[PDB]
Every structure is written in C-alpha cells, then in structure tokens.
C-alpha cells in the first residue's frame with residue numbers, strides 16, 4: 001500500500017510499533033563513505049537547487065511556492081502564508097547547514113517546483129519514562145539507557161510540491177535526496193510532523209484554537225455562531241462578550257524579553273523541557289535565535305520580579321490566506337511557542353499571552369496538545385480543532401508516547 005514508505009527505515013505498522021521497547025536506530029549502521037557523492041538521478045527537465053538563504057530572491061522564490069502551494073485546511077478555505085522574514089528565521093538557526101535545504105527547479109525558466117527543508121536540532125530521544133519503568137521490572141535498564149544522550153539530528157519541515165506536479169512521485173525523490181545530504185554530514189535520524197497519517201507515528205495530538213476577534217472569524221467562516229447561541233436574542237454580542245480580554249497583562253513584572261535575559265530563559269526553559277520524553281536542547285545562541293523578539297515573527301515576554309526572570313512565554317505569527325472571502329484577505333494567527341512557569345499557574349501565564357496577542361491584533365491563538373497545553377484549554381476557552389498532528393522519526397525505533405510527553409514545537 002506504500003510503494004515509497006515501505007522501502008524506508010521506519011516502523012511499518014502499529015503492531016510493529018507496539019512491540020518496540022527501547023529507543024534506537026532501525027537501519028544498518030552506515031558511514032559517510034558509503035553514501036553516493038552525487039545527487040540522486042532526476043528527470044532532464046528538472047535540476048536540483050540549493051537555495052542561498054542570505055539571498056532575498058532565493059527567500060522570495062520559496063515564499064511564493066509556499067504561499068501558493070503549502071498546507072490548506074480540509075475544506076480549502078485557508079492556506080498558510082509564511083512570511084519571508086519568518087522563513088529566514090525558521091530555515092536559518094545557529095549552525096544551520098545550507099545543503100540541507102533541497103529544492104527542485106524547472107531548468108528552462110528556473111521556476112521553483114518543489115522544496116524540503118532540514119535544520120539541525122539537538123534532541124533528547126532516549127527510551128521514554130514509562131518504558132524505562134517496565135525495563136527495570138524486566139531487569140533491562142542498561143539497554144533502555146543506551147541512547148539517552150541528546151542527539152544532533154535533522155528536523156524536516158516545509159515539504160511542498162507545486163500543485164501542477166502533484167501525484168507524480170516527486171515527494172519521494174525530494175525525501176531521498178534530503179536523506180542523502182543529511183547522511184553525507186553523518187546524521188542518521190530525522191524528526192518531522194505531518195497532519196496526515198503515514199507509517200508510523202510515535203505520538204499524535206489534537207489542535208486547539210482560542211478566538212481573539214470572533215467577529216472576523218465568523219465573517220471569514222473560520223468559526224460559526226454555535227447552535228446554542230440561537231436561543232439568544234443577539235448571538236454575536238454574546239460571542240464577543242464571551243471572548244473578551246483585559247487590555248493589559250495581569251502579571252506586573254511582565255515585559256518583552258531582551259538579550260540580557262537569554263541565560264535565565266535558557267535555564268528555566270531547559271529545566272522545564274527536561275520533564276518530557278522527547279524535547280530539544282537549546283544553546284544560549286539557540287535561545288537567542290528562537291525566542292528574542294523579532295518584529296512580525298516571534299513575540300516573547302518574561303515575568304521579572306526582584307531582578308530575576310521567573311516565567312516566560314513566546315508565540316509566533318503566521319498569517320493564512322483566506323481563499324474564498326470578499327471582505328478579508330488574511331487570518332492573523334498567533335501560535336503558542338515555548339514557555340515556562342515557575343511563579344504562577346500556567347493558566348495565569350497563558351492568559352497574559354492571549355491578552356498580548358489580542359492587543360497586538362491577532363485574530364486567534366492556536367496550539368497542539370503538546371507540552372502542558374491541556375492544563376489550560378478549558379479555563380482559557382480553547383476549543384479542539386479538526387484532525388490530528390502526528391509526530392514521526394526517520395530511522396528511530398520508539399515506543400508510542402502521549403503528546404503530553406512531547407516538547408518539540410514544529411514551526
């Protein structure tokens with residue numbers, strides 16, 4: 001049933017998954033020297049391209065391909081519209097590897113036809129806690145601990161084939177070539193998410209959305225006036241009132257993050273992310289890159305009291321194209337990013353996120369049920385969205401975990 005995924009070092013079924021007991025590689029160990037030097041053979045109308053992410057024109061070409069051809073909802077009403085500043089940020093973290101960004105262009109006119117991006121990530125991905133307990137009961141603790149050290153692997157994102165080229169087996173070709181370039185750098189595992197079911201996820205979670213400007217959301221048909229609001233004489237006035245927020249953060253001590261906060265934010269974040277089975281390890285340079293505010297892209301606030309940072313939150317912006325509408329071009333969405341709470345309940349920290357996002361003119365706040373995102377769904381009036389986000393590894397055997405054991409945000 002899967003002519004491509006069946007030939008790959010991934011678990012092939014849930015049954016196979018269900019009997020994985022320790023973290024570790026799927027495949028034959030191999031070396032750099034075994035991997036072909038030359039790009040995979042490709043059709044003569046196409047050519048491989050490595051974009052230069054320091055070139056505005058290169059960023060622009062990837063921007064247009066995604067604007068027109070990246071992920072839509074199931075009803076083809078909204079399509080993500082990552083900005084060029086956002087792509088620069090997401091594709092170029094500290095020590096990114098230019099060769100990991102793989103594109104296919106049409107020779108004759110250099111039109112971008114397909115893209116896939118790999119970036120480095122330092123990931124904890126050793127045997128999960130629940131399996132380590134089982135291991136102890138079996139007498140098997142050393143085997144369970146073998147791959148505990150964080151690993152420098154590849155995070156794959158932004159896979160996109162132009163609509164005119166769909167269903168011609170281009171996506172496997174891109175994935176093979178990314179894999180080759182990554183292996184040529186002595187990296188053998190990757191982590192990726194998708195909103196579709198593939199062989200075979202190690203975790204799955206729901207999406208959640210929090211209305212910030214319900215009037216606009218109803219106008220563009222992101223949201224309905226739900227059926228129980230009909231019994232009311234005036235449905236929408238009641239909807240704004242339900243979703244209203246304070247004008248200003250309720251935590252005094254709340255202020256935008258600045259560069260001098262990098263060490264403290266690193267510490268509180270890493271201490272928190274430790275509680276999860278799969279989770280990134282960030283250097284100070286990586287905290288600076290992913291969390292310092294950047295206009296239009298990422299927004300980060302710390303709670304500082306008595307000169308020390310005790311809590312923080314971050315969210316990032318992605319507008320979506322509204323594919324049908326008359327009145328509105330764009331849905332301005334805020335996505336919960338990393339955070340850490342040590343002084344106040346997480347719900348009270350995130351409420352200030354919703355307040356800031358609303359003040360700065362976002363329409364909806366969005367998140368997946370990773371991290372401790374559940375602990376605040378009901379008080380903060382999030383509702384579940386459609387479908388599920390699935391988390392995957394390439395060349396890594398891994399026991400199924402709850403999404404509440406996952407701490408990697410994928411942009």
Ligand SMILES: CCCCCCCCCCCCCC(=O)SCCNC(=O)CCNC(=O)[C@H](O)C(C)(C)COP(=O)(O)OP(=O)(O)OC[C@H]1O[C@@H](n2cnc3c(N)ncnc32)[C@H](O)[C@@H]1OP(=O)(O)O
Pocket residue numbers: 001002003004005006069070071072154156157158159160161162165166167168169170171172175178179182183187188189190192193194195196198394395
């Ligand atoms: C060590 C380093 C390893 C590095 C690599 C690690 C693996 C990275 C894996 C990539 C992680 C990406 C993470 C993200 O970015 S997920 C975001 C994916 N992008 C979108 O959904 C944007 C809109 N859609 C498209 O652009 C195209 O429909 C895509 C490109 C998705 C497929 O193109 P098309 O529709 O023209 O199809 P095809 O004929 O060329 O190919 C059909 C084959 O492709 C398999 N397929 C379909 N969708 C996905 C998908 N989302 N992940 C992996 N495989 C996918 C499918 O099951 C089939 O194989 P098999 O079922 O026949 O076997």
Ligand SMILES: N[C@@H](CC(=O)N1C[C@H](CO)[C@@H](c2ccc(Cl)cc2)C1)Cc1ccc(Cl)cc1
Pocket residue numbers: 071156157158192193194195207208209318335366367368385389410411
């Ligand atoms: N490789 C994936 C990256 C991803 O997992 N995302 C990227 C989306 C934007 O940052 C994020 C997301 C978060 C909250 C909600 Cl409600 C929807 C999508 C989840 C591709 C993908 C992109 C969009 C969607 Cl909906 C699902 C999957």
Ligand SMILES: [Mg+2]
Pocket residue numbers: 161165166167168169170171
């Ligand atoms: Mg294709």
